[PDB]
Symmetry: D2
Subunit: 116 residues, 4 copies
């Protein structure tokens, strides 16, 4: 979890093709009083990654949420999915280390975790 | 996915113990016009299940989300987790079918899918 | 409620369609003095299950292996897979309880765990 | 971007600690006429990786198998596991590409897939 230039990265692996899920919209939100505030929005590259998802601003500890717009990813291929989108809520307790959040994606199932 | 009785059930399996996650609070919300609206809340039984999570009202097609309060579950075990809670957003396309949503839970990773 | 049932069952769920993988061959082997001994072989039913996989012999605490012949399953769907077959090695600690081994299947990825 | 590296790498992530699984023995075997033959054995580094698992010999398309000795890994932490070891069988159909096989590990459940 050693620090990188940006505190947050994500990676989407299409378990059905064995290849990265490219051009997938992913948003980042910060938890506030009862609601959520959007910090950024980006699209995964040809390798299904967003190496720098946090906006170019000072980060703070607290609860956050990344929302993978995978339902749209599949709909664009005319494929159905049980999940319209996949929100992953997590906690950042140290702003001096890196957080990598991969998503192993299938149409009717998925896995996510804090990567290394 | 034939209709049974209550349209929604969930099950939490602790992958670190190979045993069910009991007494975990789970909320159900509906994606409505003006945002999300809570439909019901219950706790997993001794077997880590909630056999009938839908409230007493006709379900409609649309987006929903169950939120597993797993952060508090691990806390009671003197364990930390990357996720304060785990939201799972899903879509009901046919109201005449049963929906089962299992959660395979670990402190820093999880899996979910549409069960049988 | 499975205590008086056959000690070993499996279930294969296709995460790309959200439906069971039927008619898939699954073998059961027992770990012995340097090597493996095949105890049985069966095919998943229409619900992607094998209710009673344990053969007519006294079970003993030790290591075993179930091999899901998923490569052939995918070929029948005209799909390629990273795995020719999927072996899962597990340990039986008590011969007086039920063991359920589920398989969450995708073409290039899978998950398994001790069923609850 | 891994095209100029050794052709086979693995990575083990402990989903219970959210950290890499270090010093874990991993073997590599090739399937041939007279059964399986071992090709190499190595141990994951401090980052839970084995960057170059393929030995100094010409690689040939076909079926292979890596076995993660995870049962021993947990035992050292005074923890039990449903799996004595975790074998992963896969096909190499193009030796001009890199193959990465990650393992998401928990005591009673795991996931593996073709990485990127």
């Amino acid at each position: 979890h050693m620090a990188q230039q940006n505190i947050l990265s994500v990676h989407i692996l299409n378990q059905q093709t064995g290849k990265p899920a490219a051009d997938v919209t992913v948003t980042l939100e910060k938890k506030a009083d009862n609601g959520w505030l959007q910090l950024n929005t980006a699209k995964t590259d040809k390798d299904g990654r967003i190496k720098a998802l946090w906006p170019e601003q000072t980060a703070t500890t607290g609860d956050y949420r990344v929302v993978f717009k995978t339902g749209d990813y599949f709909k664009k291929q005319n494929l159905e999915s049980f999940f319209p989108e996949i929100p992953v809520e997590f906690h950042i307790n140290k702003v001096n280390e890196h957080y990598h959040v991969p998503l192993l994606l299938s149409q009717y199932g998925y896995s996510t975790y804090r990567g290394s």
